[PDB]
Amino acid sequence: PAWEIPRESIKLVKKLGAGQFGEVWMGYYNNSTKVAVKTLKPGTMSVQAFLEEANLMKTLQHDKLVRLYAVVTKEEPIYIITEFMAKGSLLDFLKSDEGGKVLLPKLIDFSAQIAEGMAYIERKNYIHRDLRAANVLVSESLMCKIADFGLARVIREGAKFPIKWTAPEAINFGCFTIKSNVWSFGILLYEIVTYGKIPYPGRTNADVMSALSQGYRMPRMENCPDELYDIMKMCWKEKAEERPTFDYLQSVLDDFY
C-alpha cells in the first residue's frame, strides 16, 4: 500500500533487544524522523502473522497507542516501522533506577493514560487481549502508549495469552471481551504500584488459574492507597458485566492526585 517504503530509507543504528520472535532497533527514516524498527527473524513466525500487528495498527490510530509509520516487506528481512519510545517498556522503566524514583502522582498519571488508550480501543469495538506493562511503551516526555497489538482482534498464529493477566471467564470459557481487558488493566495497575513486580508472586501459571476458579484475588499490596485498590477490585469483579468501562476508569483515575 502506502505503507510500503524502500529499505534504503531506513538506517538501523542501535540494537534494543533480540529474542525468539526477532529484534527491535532504533533507527531513522530518511535521516530526519527517529523511528523504531521491529525485525522478523525468518522461520520463526509467518510473514502474514508478523504483519498482522502492523495490519491492525493501520486501523487503530490514537495518541495513547504507538503509531505505525511504514513497513519493509519487499525483501526477506521484514521490518515494522513504528514511533520511537525512548524509555522502553513501562515494565523496564518502572524497574530501572530512574523509574524507582517516580512517585505516586505520575504512577496514577501513567495508569490514567493507558485507560485513555484502552477507552479508544473499546470505542472502536476492538479488544487487545495482551494488556500488561511490558506491552506499554514510555516516551522521553514520560508519555505512555499501548504497543504490541499481536493478539488484538475485532469483536492467533503463535503467541500465547498472558495467563497471569487474563480474566477467569476468558481462561475457563474462552470469552474474550473488552471486560476481560478491564481485568488485565487491574493487574496492570498492580504492576505500576509495585514497580514492575510479577503478578501472583511465587505462583506458577497453573496455581493461578486453579486459584481463580476458587475465587482468589491478590490482597491489598503495600504502598497502595485504599482508593486505588478499590479501582483494582472493581476491575477484578467475578461478573464481567459488573466491571467498569475504560471511559470510567480514565475519568476516576484523572480525578486523583
Find out if CATH 1.10.510.10 is the number for domain 85-257: yes
**Integer Cα distance of 158 and 90 in angstroms:** 24
**Integer Cα distance of 192 and 221 in angstroms:** 11
Integer distance in angstroms from the first to the last C-alpha of the chain? 45
Cell of 88: 522502553
Residue 43 annotated as binding site: no
Question: What is the 3-class SS of 22-53, one letter each residue?
Answer: EEEEEEEECCCEEEEEEEECCCCCCHHHHHHH
Listed resolution, Å? 2.5
CB atoms closer than 10 angstroms to residue 156: 11
Give the max Cα distance, the chain: 56
Residue 24 annotated as binding site: yes
Residues annotated as part of the active site: 130
Domain locations in the chain? 1-84, 85-257
Closest C-alpha to 144, from 198, 186, 94: 94
In which element (H, E) is residue 238 found? none
Identify how the structure was determined. X-ray
Dihedrals phi, psi of 96, to nearest 5 degrees:
-70, 165
Residue 136 annotated as binding site: no
Residue 19 annotated as binding site: yes
Distances in Å between the Cα of 242 and the Cα atoms of 179, 184, 234, 238, 245 are 9, 15, 8, 8, 9
Task: Assign 229 to helix, strand or coil.
Answer: helix
2-5 long-range contacts, CB within 8 A, separation 24+? 3/54, 3/58, 3/68, 3/70, 3/71, 4/70, 4/71, 4/72, 4/73, 4/74, 5/29, 5/70, 5/71, 5/72, 5/81
Q: Exposed, middle or buried by CB within 10 Å (0-12, 13-18, 19+), for 232? A: buried
Residue 20 annotated as binding site: yes
Q: In the CATH scheme, what is the homologous superfamily, with its name and number, of domain 1-84?
A: Phosphorylase Kinase; domain 1 (3.30.200.20)
**Integer Cα distance of 106 and 93 in angstroms:** 13
Residue 117 annotated as binding site: no
DSSP 101: G
**Integer Cα distance of 32 and 12 in angstroms:** 13
Closest C-alpha to 162, from 145, 187, 144, 138: 187
In which element (H, E) is residue 60 found? none
Residue 18 annotated as binding site: yes
Residue 188 annotated as binding site: no
